[PDB]
N, CA, C and O of each residue as an XYZ file, in Angstrom:
936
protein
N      99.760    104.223     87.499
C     100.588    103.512     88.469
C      99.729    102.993     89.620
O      98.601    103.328     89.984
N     100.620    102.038     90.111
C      99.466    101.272     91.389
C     100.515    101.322     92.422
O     101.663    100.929     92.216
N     100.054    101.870     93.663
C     100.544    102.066     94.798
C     100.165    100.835     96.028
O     100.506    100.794     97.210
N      99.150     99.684     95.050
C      99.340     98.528     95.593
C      99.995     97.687     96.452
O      99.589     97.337     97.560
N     101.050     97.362     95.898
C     102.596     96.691     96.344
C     102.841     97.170     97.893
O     102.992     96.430     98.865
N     102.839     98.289     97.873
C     103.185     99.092     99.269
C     102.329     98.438    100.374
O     103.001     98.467    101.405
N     101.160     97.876    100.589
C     100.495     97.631    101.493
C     101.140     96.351    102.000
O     100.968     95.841    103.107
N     102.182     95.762    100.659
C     102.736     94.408    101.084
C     104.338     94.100    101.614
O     104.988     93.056    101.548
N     104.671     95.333    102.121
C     106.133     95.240    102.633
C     106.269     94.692    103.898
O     107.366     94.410    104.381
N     104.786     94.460    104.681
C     105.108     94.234    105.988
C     104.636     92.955    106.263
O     104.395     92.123    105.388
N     104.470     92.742    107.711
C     103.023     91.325    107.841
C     101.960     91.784    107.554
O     101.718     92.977    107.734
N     100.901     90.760    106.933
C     100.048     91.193    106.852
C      98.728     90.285    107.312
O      98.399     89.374    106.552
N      98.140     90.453    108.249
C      97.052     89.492    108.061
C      96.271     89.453    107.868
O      95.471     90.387    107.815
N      95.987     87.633    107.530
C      94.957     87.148    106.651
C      93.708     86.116    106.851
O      93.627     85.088    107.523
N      93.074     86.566    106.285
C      91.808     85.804    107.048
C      91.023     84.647    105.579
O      91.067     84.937    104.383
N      90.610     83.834    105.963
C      90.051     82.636    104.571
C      88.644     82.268    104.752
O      88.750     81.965    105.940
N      87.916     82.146    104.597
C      86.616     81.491    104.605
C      86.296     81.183    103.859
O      85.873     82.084    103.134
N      86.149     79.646    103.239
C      85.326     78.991    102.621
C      83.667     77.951    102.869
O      83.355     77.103    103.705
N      82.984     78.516    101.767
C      81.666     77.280    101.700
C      82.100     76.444    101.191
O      83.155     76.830    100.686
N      81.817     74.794    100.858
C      82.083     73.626    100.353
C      80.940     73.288    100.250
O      80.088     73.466    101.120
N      80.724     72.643     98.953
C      79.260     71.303     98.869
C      80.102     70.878     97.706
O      80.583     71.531     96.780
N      80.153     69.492     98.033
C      80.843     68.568     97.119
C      79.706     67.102     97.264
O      79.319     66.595     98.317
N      79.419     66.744     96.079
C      78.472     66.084     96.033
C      77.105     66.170     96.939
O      76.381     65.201     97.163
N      76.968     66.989     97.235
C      75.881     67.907     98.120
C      76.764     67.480     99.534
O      75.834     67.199    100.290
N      77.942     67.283    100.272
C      78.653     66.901    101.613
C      78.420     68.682    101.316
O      78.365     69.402    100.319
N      78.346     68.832    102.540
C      78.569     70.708    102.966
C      79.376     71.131    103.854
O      79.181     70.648    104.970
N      80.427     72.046    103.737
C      81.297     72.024    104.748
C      81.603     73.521    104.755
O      81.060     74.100    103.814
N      82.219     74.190    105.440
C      82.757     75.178    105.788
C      84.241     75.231    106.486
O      84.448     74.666    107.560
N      85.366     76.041    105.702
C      86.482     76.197    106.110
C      86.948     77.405    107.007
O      86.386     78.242    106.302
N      87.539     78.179    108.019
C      87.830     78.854    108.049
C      89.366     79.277    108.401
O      89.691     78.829    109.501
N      90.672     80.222    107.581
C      91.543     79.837    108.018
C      91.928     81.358    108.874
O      91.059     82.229    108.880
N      93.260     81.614    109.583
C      93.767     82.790    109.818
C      95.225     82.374    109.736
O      95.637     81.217    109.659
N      96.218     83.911    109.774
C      97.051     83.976    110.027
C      97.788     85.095    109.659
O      97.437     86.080    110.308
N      99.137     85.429    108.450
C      99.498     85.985    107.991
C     100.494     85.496    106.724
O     101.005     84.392    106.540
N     100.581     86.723    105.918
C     101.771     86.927    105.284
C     102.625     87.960    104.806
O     102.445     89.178    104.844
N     103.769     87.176    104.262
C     105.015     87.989    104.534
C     105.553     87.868    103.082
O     106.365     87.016    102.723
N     105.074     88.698    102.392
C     105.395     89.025    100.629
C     106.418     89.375    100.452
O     106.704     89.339     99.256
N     107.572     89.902    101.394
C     108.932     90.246    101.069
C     109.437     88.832    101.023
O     110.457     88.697    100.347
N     108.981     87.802    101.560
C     109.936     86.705    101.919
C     109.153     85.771    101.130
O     109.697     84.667    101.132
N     107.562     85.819    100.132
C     106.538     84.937     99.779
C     106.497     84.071    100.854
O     106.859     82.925    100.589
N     106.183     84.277    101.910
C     106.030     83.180    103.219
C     104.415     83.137    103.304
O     103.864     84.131    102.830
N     103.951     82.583    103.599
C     102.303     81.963    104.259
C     102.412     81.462    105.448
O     103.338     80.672    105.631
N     101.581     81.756    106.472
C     101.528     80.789    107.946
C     100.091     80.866    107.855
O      99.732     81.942    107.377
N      99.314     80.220    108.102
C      97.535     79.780    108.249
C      97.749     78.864    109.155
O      98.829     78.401    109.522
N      96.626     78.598    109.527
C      95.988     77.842    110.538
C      94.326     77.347    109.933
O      93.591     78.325    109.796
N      93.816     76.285    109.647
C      92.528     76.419    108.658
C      91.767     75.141    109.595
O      92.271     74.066    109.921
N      90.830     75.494    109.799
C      89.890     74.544    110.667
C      88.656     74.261    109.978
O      87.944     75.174    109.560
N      88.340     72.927    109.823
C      86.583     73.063    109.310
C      85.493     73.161    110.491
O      85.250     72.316    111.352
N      84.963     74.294    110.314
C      84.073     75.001    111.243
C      83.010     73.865    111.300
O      82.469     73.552    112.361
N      82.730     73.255    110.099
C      81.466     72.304    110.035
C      81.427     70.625    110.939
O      80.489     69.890    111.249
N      82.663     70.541    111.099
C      83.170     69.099    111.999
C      83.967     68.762    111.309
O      84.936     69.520    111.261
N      84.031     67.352    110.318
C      84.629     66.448    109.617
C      84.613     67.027    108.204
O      83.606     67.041    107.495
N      86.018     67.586    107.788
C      86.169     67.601    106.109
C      86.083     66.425    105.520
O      86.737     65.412    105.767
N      84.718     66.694    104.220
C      84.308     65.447    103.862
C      85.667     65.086    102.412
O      85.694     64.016    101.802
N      86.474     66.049    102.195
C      87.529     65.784    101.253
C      88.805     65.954    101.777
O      88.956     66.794    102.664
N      89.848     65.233    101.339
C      91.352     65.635    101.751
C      91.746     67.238    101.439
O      91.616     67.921    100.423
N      92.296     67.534    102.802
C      93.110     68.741    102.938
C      94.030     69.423    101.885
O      93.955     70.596    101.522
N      94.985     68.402    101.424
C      95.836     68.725    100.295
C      94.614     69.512     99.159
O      94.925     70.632     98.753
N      93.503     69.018     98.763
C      92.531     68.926     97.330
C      92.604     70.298     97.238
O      92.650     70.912     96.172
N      92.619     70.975     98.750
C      92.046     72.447     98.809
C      93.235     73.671     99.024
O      92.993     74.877     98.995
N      94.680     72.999     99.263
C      95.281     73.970     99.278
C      95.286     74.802     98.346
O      95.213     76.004     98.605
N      95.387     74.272     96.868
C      95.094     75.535     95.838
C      94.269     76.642     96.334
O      94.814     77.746     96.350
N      92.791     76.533     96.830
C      92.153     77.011     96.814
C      91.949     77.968     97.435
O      91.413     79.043     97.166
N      92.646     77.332     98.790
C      92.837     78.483    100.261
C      93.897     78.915    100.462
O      94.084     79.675    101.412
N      96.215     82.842     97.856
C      96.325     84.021     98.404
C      97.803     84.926     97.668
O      98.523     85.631     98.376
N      98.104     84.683     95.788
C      98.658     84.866     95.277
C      99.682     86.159     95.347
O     100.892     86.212     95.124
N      98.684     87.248     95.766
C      99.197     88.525     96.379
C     100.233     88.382     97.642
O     100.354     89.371     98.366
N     100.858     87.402     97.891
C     101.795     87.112     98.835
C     103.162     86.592     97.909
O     104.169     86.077     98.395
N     102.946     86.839     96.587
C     104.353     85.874     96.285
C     104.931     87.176     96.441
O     104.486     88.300     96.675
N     106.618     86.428     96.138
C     107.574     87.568     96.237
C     108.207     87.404     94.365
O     108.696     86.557     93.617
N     107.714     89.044     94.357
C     108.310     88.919     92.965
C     109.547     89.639     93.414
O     109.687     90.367     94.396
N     110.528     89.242     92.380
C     112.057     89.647     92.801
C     111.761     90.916     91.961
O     110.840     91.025     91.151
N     112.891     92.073     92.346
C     112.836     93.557     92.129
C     112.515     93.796     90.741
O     111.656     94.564     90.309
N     113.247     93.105     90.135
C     113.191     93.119     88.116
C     112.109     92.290     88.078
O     112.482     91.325     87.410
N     110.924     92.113     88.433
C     110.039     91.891     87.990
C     108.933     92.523     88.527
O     107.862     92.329     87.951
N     108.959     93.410     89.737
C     107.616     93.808     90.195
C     106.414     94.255     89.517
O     105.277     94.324     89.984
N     107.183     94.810     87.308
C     106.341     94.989     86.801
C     105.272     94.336     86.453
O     104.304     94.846     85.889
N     105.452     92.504     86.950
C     104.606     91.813     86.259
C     103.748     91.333     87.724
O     103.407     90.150     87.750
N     103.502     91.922     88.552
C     102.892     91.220     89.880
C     100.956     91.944     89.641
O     100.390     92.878     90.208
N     100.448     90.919     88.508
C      98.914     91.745     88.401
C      98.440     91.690     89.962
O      97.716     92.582     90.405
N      98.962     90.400     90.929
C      97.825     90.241     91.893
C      97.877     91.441     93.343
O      96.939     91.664     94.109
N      99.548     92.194     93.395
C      99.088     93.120     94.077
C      98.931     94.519     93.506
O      98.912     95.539     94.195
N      98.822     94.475     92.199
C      98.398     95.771     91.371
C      97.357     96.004     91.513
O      96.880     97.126     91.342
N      96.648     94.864     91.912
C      94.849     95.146     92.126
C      94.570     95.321     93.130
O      93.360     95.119     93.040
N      94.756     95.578     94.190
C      94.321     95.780     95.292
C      94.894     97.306     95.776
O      95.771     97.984     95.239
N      94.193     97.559     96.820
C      93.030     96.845     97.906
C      92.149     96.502     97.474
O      91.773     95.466     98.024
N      91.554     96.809     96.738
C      90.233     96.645     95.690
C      89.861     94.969     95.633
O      88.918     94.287     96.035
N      91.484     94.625     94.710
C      91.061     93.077     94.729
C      91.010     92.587     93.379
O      91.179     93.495     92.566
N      90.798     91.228     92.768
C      90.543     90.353     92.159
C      89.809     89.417     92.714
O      89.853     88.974     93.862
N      88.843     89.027     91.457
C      87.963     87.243     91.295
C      89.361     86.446     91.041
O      90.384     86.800     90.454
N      89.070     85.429     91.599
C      89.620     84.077     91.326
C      89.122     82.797     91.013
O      88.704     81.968     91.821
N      89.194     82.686     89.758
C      87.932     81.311     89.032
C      88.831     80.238     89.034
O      89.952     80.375     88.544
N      88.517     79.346     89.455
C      88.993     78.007     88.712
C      88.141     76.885     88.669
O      87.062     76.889     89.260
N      88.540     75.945     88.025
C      88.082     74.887     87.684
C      88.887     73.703     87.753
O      89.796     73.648     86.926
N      88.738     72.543     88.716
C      89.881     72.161     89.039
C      89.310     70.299     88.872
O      88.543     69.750     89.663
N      89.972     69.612     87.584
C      89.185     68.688     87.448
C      90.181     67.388     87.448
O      91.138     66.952     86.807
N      89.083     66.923     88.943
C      90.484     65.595     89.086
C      89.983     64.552     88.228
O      88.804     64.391     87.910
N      91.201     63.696     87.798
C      91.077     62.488     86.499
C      90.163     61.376     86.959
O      90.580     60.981     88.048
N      89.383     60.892     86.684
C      88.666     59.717     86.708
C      87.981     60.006     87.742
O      87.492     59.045     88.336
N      87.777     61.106     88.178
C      86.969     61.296     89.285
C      85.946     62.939     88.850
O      85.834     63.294     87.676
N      85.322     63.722     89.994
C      84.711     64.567     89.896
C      85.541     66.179     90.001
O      86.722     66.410     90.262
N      84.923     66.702     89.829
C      85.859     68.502     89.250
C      85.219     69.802     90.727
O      84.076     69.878     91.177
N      86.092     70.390     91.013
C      86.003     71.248     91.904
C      85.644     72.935     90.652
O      86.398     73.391     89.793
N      84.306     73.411     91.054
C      84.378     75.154     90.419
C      84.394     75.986     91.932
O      83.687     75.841     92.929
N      85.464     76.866     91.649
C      85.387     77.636     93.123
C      85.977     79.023     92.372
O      86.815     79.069     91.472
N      85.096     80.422     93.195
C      84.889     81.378     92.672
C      85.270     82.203     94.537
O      84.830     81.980     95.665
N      86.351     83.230     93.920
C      86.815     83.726     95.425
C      87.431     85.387     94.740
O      88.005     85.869     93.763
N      86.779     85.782     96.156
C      87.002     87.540     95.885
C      88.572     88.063     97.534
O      88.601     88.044     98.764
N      89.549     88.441     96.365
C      90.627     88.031     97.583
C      91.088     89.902     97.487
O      91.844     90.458     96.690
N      90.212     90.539     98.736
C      90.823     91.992     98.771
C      90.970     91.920    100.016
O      90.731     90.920    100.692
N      91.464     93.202    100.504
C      91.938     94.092    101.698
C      90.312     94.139    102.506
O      89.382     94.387    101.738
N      90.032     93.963    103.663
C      89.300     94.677    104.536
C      89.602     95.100    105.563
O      90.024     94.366    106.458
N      89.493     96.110    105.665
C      90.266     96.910    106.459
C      91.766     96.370    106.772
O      92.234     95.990    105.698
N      92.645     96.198    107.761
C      93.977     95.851    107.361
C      94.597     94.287    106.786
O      95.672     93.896    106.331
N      92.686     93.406    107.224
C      93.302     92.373    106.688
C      93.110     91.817    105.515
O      92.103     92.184    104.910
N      93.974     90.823    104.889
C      93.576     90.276    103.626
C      92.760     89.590    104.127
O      92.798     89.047    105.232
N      91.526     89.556    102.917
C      90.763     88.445    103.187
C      90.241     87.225    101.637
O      89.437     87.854    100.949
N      90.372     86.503    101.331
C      90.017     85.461    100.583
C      88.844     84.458    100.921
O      88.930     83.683    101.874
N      88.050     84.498    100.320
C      86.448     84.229    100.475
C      85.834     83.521     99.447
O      85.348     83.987     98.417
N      85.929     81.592    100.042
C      85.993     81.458     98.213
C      83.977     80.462     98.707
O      83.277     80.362     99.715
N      83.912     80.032     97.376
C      82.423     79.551     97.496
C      82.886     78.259     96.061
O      83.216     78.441     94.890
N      82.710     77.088     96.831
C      83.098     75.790     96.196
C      82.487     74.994     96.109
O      82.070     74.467     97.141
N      82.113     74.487     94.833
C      81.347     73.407     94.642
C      81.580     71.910     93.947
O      82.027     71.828     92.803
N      81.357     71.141     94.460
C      82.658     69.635     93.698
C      81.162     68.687     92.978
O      79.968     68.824     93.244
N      81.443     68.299     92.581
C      80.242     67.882     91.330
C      80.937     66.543     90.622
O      82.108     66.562     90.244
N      79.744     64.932     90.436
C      80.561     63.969     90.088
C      81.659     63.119     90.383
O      82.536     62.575     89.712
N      81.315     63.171     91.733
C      82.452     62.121     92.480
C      82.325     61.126     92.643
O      81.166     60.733     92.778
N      83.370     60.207     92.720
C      83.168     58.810     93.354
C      83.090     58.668     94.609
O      84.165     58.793     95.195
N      81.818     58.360     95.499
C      82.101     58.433     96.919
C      83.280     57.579     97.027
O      84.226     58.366     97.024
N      83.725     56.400     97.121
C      84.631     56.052     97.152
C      85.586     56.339     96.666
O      86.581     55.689     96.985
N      85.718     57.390     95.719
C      87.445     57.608     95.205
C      87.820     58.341     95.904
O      87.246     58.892     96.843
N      89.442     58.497     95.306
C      90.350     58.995     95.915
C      89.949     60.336     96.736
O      90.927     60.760     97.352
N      88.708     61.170     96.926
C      88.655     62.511     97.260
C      87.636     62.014     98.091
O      87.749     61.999     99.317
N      86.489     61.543     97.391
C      85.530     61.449     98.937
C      86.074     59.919     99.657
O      85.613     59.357    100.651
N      86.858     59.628     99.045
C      87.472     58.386    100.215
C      88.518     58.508    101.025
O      88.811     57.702    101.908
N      89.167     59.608    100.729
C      90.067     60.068    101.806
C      91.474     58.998    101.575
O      92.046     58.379    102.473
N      91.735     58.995    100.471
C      93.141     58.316    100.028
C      94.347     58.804     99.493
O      95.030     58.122     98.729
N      94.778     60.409     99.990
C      95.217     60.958     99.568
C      96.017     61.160    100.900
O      95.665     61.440    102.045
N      97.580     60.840    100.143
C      98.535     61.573    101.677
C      97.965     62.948    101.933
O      97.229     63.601    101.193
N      98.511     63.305    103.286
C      98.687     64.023    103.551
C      99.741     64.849    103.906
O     100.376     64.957    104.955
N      99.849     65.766    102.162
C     101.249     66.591    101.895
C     100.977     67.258    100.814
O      99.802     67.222    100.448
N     101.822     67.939    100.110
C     101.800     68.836     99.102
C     103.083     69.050     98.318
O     104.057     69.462     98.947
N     103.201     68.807     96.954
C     104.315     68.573     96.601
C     104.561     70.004     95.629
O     103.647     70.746     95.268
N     105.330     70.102     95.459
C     106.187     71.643     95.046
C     105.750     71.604     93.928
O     105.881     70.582     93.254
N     104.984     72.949     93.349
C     104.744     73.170     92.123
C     105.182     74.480     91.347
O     105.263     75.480     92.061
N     105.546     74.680     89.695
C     105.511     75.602     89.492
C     103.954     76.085     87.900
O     103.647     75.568     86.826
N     103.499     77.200     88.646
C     102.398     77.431     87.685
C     102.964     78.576     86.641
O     103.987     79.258     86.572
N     102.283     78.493     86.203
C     102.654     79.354     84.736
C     101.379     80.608     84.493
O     100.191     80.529     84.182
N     102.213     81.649     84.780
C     100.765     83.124     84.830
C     101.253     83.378     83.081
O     102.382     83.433     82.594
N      99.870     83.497     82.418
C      99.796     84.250     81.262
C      98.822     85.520     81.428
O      98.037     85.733     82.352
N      99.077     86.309     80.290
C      98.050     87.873     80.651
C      97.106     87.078     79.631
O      97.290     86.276     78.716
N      95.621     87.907     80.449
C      94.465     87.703     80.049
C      94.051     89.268     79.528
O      93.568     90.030     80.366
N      94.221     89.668     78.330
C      94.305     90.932     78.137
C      92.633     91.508     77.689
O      92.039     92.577     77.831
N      92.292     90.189     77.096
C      90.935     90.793     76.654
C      89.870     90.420     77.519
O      88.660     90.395     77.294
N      90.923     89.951     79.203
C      89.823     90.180     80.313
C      90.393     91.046     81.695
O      90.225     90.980     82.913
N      91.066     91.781     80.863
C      92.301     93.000     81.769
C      92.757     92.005     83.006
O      92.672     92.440     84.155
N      93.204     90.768     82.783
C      93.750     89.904     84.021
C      94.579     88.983     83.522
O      94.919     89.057     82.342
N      95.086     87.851     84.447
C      95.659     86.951     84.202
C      94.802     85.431     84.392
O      93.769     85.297     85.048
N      95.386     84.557     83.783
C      95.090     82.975     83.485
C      96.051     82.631     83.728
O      97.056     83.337     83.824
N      95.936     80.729     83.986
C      97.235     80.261     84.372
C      96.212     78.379     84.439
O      95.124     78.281     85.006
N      96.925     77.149     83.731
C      96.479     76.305     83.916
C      98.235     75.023     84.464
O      99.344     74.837     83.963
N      97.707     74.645     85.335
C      98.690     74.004     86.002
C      98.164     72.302     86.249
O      97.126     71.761     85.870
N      98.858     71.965     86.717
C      98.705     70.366     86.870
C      99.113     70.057     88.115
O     100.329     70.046     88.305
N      98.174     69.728     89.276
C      98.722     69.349     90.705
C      98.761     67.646     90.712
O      97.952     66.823     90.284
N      99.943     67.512     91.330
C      99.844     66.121     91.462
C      99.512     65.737     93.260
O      99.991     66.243     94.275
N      98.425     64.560     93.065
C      98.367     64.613     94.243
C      98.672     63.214     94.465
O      98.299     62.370     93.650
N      99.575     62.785     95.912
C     100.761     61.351     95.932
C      99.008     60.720     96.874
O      98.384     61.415     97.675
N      98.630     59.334     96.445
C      97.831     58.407     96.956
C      98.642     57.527     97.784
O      99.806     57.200     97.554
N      97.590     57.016     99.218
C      98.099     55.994     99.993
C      98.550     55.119     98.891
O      99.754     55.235     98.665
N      98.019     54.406     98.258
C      98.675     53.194     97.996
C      99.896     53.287     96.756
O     100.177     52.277     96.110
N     100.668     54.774     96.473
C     101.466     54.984     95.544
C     100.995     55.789     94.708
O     101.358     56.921     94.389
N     100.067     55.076     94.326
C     100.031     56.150     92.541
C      99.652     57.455     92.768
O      99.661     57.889     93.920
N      99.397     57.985     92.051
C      99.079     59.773     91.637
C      98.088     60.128     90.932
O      97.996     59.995     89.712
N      97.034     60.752     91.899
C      95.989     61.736     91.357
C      96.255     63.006     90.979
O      96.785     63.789     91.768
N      95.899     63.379     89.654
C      95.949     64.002     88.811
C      94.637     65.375     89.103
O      93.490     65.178     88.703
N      95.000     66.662     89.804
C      94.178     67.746     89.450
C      94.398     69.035     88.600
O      95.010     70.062     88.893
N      93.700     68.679     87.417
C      93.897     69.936     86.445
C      92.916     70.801     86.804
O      91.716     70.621     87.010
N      93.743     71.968     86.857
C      93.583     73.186     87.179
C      93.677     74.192     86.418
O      94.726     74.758     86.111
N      92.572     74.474     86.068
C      92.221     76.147     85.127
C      91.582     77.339     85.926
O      90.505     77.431     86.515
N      92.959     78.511     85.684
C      92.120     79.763     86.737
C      92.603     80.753     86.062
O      93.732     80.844     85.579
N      91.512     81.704     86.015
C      90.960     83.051     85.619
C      90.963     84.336     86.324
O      89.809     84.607     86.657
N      91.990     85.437     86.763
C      91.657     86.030     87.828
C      91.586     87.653     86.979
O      92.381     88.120     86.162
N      90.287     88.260     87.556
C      90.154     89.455     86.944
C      89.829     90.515     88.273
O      89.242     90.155     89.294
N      90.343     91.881     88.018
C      90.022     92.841     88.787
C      89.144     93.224     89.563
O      89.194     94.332     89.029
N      88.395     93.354     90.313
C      87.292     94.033     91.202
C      87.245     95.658     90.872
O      86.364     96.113     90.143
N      87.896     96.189     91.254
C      88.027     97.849     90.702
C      88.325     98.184     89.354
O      88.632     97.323     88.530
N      88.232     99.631     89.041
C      88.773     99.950     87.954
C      90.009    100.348     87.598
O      90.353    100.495     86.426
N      90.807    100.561     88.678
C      92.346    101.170     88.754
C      92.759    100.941     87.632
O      92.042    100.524     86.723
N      93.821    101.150     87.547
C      94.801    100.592     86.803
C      95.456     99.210     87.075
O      95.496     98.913     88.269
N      95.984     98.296     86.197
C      96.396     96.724     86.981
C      97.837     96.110     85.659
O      97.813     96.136     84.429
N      98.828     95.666     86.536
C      99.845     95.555     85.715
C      99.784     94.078     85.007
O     100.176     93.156     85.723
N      99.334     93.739     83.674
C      99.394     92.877     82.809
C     100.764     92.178     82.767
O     101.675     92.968     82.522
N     101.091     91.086     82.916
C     102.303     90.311     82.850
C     102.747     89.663     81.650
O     102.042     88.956     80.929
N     103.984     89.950     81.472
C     104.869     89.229     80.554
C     104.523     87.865     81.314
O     104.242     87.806     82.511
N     104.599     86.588     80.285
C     104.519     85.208     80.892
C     106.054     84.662     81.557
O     107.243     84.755     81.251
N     105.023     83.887     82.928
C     106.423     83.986     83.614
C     105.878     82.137     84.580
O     105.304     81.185     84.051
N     106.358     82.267     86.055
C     105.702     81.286     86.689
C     106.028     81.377     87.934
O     107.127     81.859     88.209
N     104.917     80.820     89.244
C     104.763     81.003     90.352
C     105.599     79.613     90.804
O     105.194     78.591     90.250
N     106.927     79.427     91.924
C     107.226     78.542     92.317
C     106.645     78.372     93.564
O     106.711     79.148     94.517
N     106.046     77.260     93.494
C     105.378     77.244     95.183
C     105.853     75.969     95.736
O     105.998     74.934     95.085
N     106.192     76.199     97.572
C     106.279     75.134     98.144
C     105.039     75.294     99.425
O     104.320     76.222     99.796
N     105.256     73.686     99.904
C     103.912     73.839    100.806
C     105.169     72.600    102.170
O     106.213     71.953    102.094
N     104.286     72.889    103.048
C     104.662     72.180    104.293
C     103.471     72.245    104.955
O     103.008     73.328    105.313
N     102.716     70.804    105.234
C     101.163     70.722    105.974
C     101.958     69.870    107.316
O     102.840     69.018    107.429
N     101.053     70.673    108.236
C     101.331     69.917    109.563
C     100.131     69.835    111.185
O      99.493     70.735    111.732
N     100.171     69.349    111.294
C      98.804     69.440    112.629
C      99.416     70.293    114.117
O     100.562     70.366    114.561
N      98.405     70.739    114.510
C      98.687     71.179    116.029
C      98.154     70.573    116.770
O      97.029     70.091    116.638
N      99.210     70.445    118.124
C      98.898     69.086    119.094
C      97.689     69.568    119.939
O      97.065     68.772    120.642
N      97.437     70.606    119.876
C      96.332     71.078    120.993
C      94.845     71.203    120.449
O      93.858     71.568    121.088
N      94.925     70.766    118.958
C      93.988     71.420    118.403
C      92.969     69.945    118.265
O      93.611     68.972    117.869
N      92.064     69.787    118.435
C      91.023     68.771    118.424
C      89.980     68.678    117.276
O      89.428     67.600    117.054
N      89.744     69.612    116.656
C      88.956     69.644    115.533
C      90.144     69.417    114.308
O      91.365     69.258    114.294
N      89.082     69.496    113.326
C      89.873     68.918    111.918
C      90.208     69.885    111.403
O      89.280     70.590    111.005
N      91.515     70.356    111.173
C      92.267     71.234    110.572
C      93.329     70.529    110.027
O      93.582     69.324    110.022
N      94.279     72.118    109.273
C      95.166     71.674    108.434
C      96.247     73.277    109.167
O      96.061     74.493    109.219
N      97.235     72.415    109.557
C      98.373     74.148    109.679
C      99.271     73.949    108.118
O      99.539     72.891    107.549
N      99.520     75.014    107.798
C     100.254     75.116    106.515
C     101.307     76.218    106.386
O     101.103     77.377    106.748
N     102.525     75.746    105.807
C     103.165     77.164    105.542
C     103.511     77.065    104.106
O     103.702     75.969    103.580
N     103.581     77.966    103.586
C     103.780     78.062    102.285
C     104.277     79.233    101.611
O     103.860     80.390    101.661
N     105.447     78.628    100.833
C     106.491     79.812     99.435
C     105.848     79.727     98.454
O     105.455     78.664     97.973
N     105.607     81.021     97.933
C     105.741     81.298     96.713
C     106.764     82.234     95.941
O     107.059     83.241     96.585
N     107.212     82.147     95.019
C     107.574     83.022     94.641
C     108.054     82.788     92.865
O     108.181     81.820     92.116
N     108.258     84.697     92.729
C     107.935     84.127     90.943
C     109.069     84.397     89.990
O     109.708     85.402     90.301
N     109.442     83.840     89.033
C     110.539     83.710     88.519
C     110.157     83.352     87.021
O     108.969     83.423     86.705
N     111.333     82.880     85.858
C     110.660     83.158     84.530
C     110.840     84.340     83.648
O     110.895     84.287     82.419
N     110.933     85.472     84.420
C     111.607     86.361     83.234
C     112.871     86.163     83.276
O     113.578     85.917     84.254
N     113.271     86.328     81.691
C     114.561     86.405     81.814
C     115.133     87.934     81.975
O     114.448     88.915     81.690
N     116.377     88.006     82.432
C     117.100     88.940     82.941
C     118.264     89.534     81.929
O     119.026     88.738     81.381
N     118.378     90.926     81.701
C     119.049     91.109     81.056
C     120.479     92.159     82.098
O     120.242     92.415     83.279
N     121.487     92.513     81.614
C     122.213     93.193     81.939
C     121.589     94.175     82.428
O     121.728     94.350     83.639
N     120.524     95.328     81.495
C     120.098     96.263     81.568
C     119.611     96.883     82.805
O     119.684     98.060     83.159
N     118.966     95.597     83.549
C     118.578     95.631     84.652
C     119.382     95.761     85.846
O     119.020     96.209     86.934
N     120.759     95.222     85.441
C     121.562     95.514     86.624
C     121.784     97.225     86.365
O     122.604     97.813     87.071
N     121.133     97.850     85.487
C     121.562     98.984     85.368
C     123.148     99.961     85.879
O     123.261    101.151     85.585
């Protein structure tokens, strides 16, 4: 059994730091704030420490804290991401936008001391300076997604490949496929999931006081997909 879950009944806060080199541009993210896993709520605050983000904000929300969704009661059996902790999970993905260049970002998301922390190291490879990512043609927003967790059994974790759509100034839609891999840090024990899916919403917004280049964000998750039987109403 994992006594995990328990660390997530309350607020909790959370801290983000990312490296960036995308086409050798180098940047550094850092976010704070908290969350609230009874309710899958997110509040951050994410600033690029380095000056000017050389890519759109949206590219990276994937990137910049799963252990916050709210799994509803009849499902807590399938929540691998706070079964692992404090300890933690890797988080791999590979995130490859269409006609353009692919994001690999590799992040270790545990407990230090009371806060969460997520710590990812990103590298974007094959871009069009001018396209849609290093040209900065991408609204700024985030449109509601739902991902799909499968168990990764013969890597004691979960996988999950999703499709973000991202809305362009001039209409159309960039396309980021997304493949991620998340495996344990410790040896505990970690609860393998029946396949199910993460509903997420996002809301990006700026602060008036804030002068550097950031992104404020709040964000739902939460997970749904099993089906429900009577039994459960016990």
């Amino acid at each position: 059994v994992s006594k995990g879950e328990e660390l997530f009944t309350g607020v909790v806060p959370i801290l983000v730091e990312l490296d960036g080199d995308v086409n050798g541009h180098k940047f550094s993210v850092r976010g704070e704030g908290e969350g609230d896993a009874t309710n899958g709520k997110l509040t951050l605050k994410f600033i690029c420490t380095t000056g000017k983000l050389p890519v759109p904000w949206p590219t990276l929300v994937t990137t910049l804290v799963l252990c916050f969704a709210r799994y509803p009661d009849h499902m807590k059996q399938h929540d691998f991401f706070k079964s692992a902790m404090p300890e933690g999970y890797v988080q791999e993905r590979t995130i490859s936008f269409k006609d353009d260049g692919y994001y690999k970002t590799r992040a270790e998301v545990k407990f230090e001391g009371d806060t969460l922390v997520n710590r990812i190291e990103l590298k974007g490879i094959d871009f069009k300076e001018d396209g849609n990512i290093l040209g900065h043609k991408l609204e700024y927003n985030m449109n509601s997604h739902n991902a799909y967790i499968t168990a990764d059994k013969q890597k004691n974790g979960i996988k999950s490949n999703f499709k973000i759509r991202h809305n362009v100034e001039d209409g159309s839609v960039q396309l980021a496929d997304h493949y991620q891999q998340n495996t344990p840090i410790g040896d505990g024990p970690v609860l393998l999931p029946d396949n199910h899916y993460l509903s997420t919403q996002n809301a990006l917004s700026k602060d008036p006081n804030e002068k550097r280049d950031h992104m404020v964000l709040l964000e739902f998750v939460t997970a749904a997909g099993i089906t429900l039987g009577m039994d459960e109403l016990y």
